[PDB]
Scaffold this active site. Structure first.
Site, PDB file in Angstrom:
ATOM      1  N   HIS A 188       0.809  -1.216   0.000  1.00  0.00           N
ATOM      2  CA  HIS A 188       0.000   0.000   0.000  1.00  0.00           C
ATOM      3  C   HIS A 188       0.847   1.273   0.000  1.00  0.00           C
ATOM      4  CE1 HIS A 188       0.509  -0.234   4.452  1.00  0.00           C
ATOM      5  NE2 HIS A 188       0.463   1.081   4.354  1.00  0.00           N
ATOM      6  N   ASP A 250       0.106  -7.657   2.414  1.00  0.00           N
ATOM      7  CA  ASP A 250       0.501  -6.273   2.209  1.00  0.00           C
ATOM      8  C   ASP A 250       2.017  -6.141   2.192  1.00  0.00           C
ATOM      9  OD1 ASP A 250       0.552  -3.508   2.002  1.00  0.00           O
ATOM     10  OD2 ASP A 250       0.437  -3.253   4.182  1.00  0.00           O
ATOM     11  N   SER A 344       4.604   2.926   7.418  1.00  0.00           N
ATOM     12  CA  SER A 344       4.148   1.909   6.481  1.00  0.00           C
ATOM     13  C   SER A 344       5.327   1.339   5.700  1.00  0.00           C
ATOM     14  CB  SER A 344       3.103   2.488   5.526  1.00  0.00           C
ATOM     15  OG  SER A 344       1.929   2.866   6.224  1.00  0.00           O
TER      16      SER A 344
END
Length: 397
Positions: A188, A250, A344
């Site tokens: 992502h 992810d 992230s």
């Protein structure tokens, strides 16, 4: 004429046919022993031909036998060539030795690295033969020590962390260096936010190698180092089963356009070699605001324990958020502010004793908004997809 003089076989050579006496129109080939060749006016040849002339003289003089020259050895990337004599002999029977650039590289299979100049003019190793050795990047061995939550990271103790920034240097994600040319991060991180009314990932959504760069050996969040290496992106590969809505698988892989120079400040992190346990202590690092009031000046880290899968699922169940088997949770207590640790894609690493090696356990997941994930910190369980990663990058510990 018509007889020609007795012929002398050269040193390390011979003559054929071997006749007691040679007479007009007779012909002979001069050749050399194994590892030697005929030398006529700086031209190498298997054989040279002489004949007995009418006047009783040979058409030419006996040439000489020059030892075979394996010439210049093949270059070992990240390696070194050490001749077995101060004269650097590249001729038949001479030897050389390949060594990888320690400590930042090690030789694969611990091959002897010894090559001998063969009779056919080729450097040969007992095992690999003609093929060269392989120098692999040593992973998870920081050169600087740890003084010994939440706290600024000591300079040099996180040489594998990567900053995914805009072309201007503005960060938007974290990552980890694998092998020589790979950055492992979160899927992502590599695409723009999807439309809530049409939550489907498309190619136009993906960002291109032209949109961002990778920064290694970086300590300050905004300031520059002399250790910072700004690398361009070649290609990106998101996990085949990545779901941007549930954050399943992810994880993503970024192939660098140019490889970083491995040193005390830039080194790859080791892959997992087994699943993690509950309570196991891990370290999570990043430059984001994270669990802090304001954004930090330097890299931050925090040592937190792993939470068992079940307890995590149960804490997120009342929020209709399914923690898949490809996900791993960590932190101390639910809503304990340490569920916001890292950026992230950022690294979650732990120490493998008594191997004295650090390795990657997971990558920060579930987005960069902690409000949407305040129960526990959720990461992409690297162990789960080690095969795919190793398959794609071709990386070995």
């Amino acid at each position: 004429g018509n007889e020609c003089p007795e012929l002398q076989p050269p040193v390390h050579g011979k003559i054929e046919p071997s006749q007691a006496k040679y007479f007009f129109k007779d012909q002979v080939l001069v050749s050399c022993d194994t590892g030697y060749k005929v030398l006529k006016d700086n031209v190498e040849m298997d054989t040279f031909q002489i004949e007995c002339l009418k006047d009783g003289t040979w058409s030419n003089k006996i040439p000489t036998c020059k030892i075979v020259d394996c010439r210049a050895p093949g270059e070992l990337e990240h390696g070194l060539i050490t001749f077995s004599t101060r004269n650097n002999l590249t001729t038949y029977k001479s030897e050389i030795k390949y060594s990888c650039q320690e400590p930042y590289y090690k030789m694969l299979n611990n091959n002897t690295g010894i090559y001998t100049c063969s009779a056919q003019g080729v450097w040969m190793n007992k095992v690999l033969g003609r093929s060269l050795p392989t120098c692999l990047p040593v992973c998870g061995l920081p050169k600087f020590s740890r003084k010994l939550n939440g706290r600024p990271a000591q300079k040099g103790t996180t040489p594998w962390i990567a900053m995914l920034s805009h072309l201007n240097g503005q960060p938007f994600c974290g990552g980890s260096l694998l092998g020589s040319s790979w950055i492992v991060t979160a899927a992502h991180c590599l695409h723009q936010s999807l439309d809530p009314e049409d939550p489907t990932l498309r190619d136009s959504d993906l960002l291109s190698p032209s949109d961002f760069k990778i920064i290694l050996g970086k300590h300050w969040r905004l300031r520059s180092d002399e250790n910072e290496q700004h690398l361009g992106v070649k290609h990106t590969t998101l996990h085949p089963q990545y779901d941007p809505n549930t954050f399943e698988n992810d994880v993503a892989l970024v192939e660098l356009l140019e490889s970083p120079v491995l040193n005390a400040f830039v080194m790859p992190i080791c892959l997992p070699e087994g699943p993690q346990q509950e309570g196991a202590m891990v370290i999570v690092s990043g430059w984001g605001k994270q669990f802090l009031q304001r954004f930090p000046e330097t890299l931050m880290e925090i040592e937190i324990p792993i939470v068992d899968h079940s307890t995590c699922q149960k804490a997120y169940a009342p929020l209709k958020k399914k923690v898949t088997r490809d996900m791993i949770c960590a932190g101390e207590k639910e809503g304990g502010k340490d569920a916001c640790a890292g950026d992230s894609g950022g690294p979650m690493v732990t120490l493998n004793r008594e191997r004295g090696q650090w390795y990657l356990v997971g990558t920060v997941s579930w987005g960069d908004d902690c409000g949407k994930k305040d129960r526990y910190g959720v990461y992409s369980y690297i162990h789960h997809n080690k095969d795919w990663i190793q398959r794609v990058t071709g990386v070995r510990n």
